[PDB]
């Protein structure tokens, strides 16, 4: 999937958003 740190995906409901240094930081 692309850049989940992105308006689209943002959100890191889903483990498939773990690599997001948006919201793991």
């Known amino acids: 999937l692309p850049p989940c740190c992105t ?5 890191c409901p889903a483990p498939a958003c773990k690599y997001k ?3 793991k930081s």
């Open 7 to 11: 308006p689209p995906k943002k959100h």
């Open 21 to 23: 240094p948006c919201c």
